């Protein structure tokens, strides 16, 4: 899709507080079409339902972690191009490499500011012509 008010986001994290941060930041930026999932399976269930244009996802989560989530999305014919922004406390260079090589559209380290999220989302929008 396009980075207009209608773009539908999926915000994935096993902790409510973290999802709430992202949802509120997106609202501020003018994106109100936003759904949440608590783990990778929950996320795929919603994604396969259709209509999503952007995923923002944690890494460490039960049932299916965010790296598996990202890999699954990238390998799936119907959603292989979906933007996926990783947002995680994992800061080791080897975590960043693993996610980058798996196809992350971007990578933000927790804790993060409103400015940081905005600029990294905008970097992805520009890269993809949205």
74 versus 110: smaller Cβ distance to ligand MOO: 110
Smallest gap from Cβ 62 to Mn ion, in A, equals 9
Smallest gap from Cβ 90 to ligand MOO, in A, equals 5
In sign, the C-alpha dihedral spanning 117, 97, 44, 15 is: negative
Residues in contact with ligand MOO by the rule CB under 6 A: 58-60, 88-90, 110
The end-to-end CA distance of the chain, in Å, is 7
Smallest gap from Cβ 23 to ligand MOO, in A, equals 16
88 versus 124: smaller Cβ distance to ligand MOO: 88
15 versus 32: smaller Cβ distance to Mn ion: 15
Residues in contact with Mn ion by the rule CB under 5 A: 14, 58, 60
18 versus 34: smaller Cβ distance to Mn ion: 18
């Amino acid at each position: 899709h396009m980075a207009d008010k209608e773009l539908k986001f999926l915000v994935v994290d096993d902790f409510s507080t973290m999802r709430r941060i992202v949802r509120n930041l997106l609202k501020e930026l003018g994106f109100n079409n936003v759904e949440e999932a608590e783990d990778g399976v929950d996320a795929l269930n919603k994604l396969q339902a259709g209509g999503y244009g952007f995923v923002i996802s944690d890494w460490d989560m039960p049932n299916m972690d965010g790296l598996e989530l990202l890999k699954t999305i990238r390998a799936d014919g119907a959603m292989s191009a979906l933007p996926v922004l990783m947002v995680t406390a994992r800061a080791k260079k080897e975590n960043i490499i693993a996610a980058a090589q798996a196809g992350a559209s971007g990578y933000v380290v927790k804790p993060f500011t409103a400015a940081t999220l905005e600029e990294k989302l905008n970097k992805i929008f520009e890269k993809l012509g949205m």
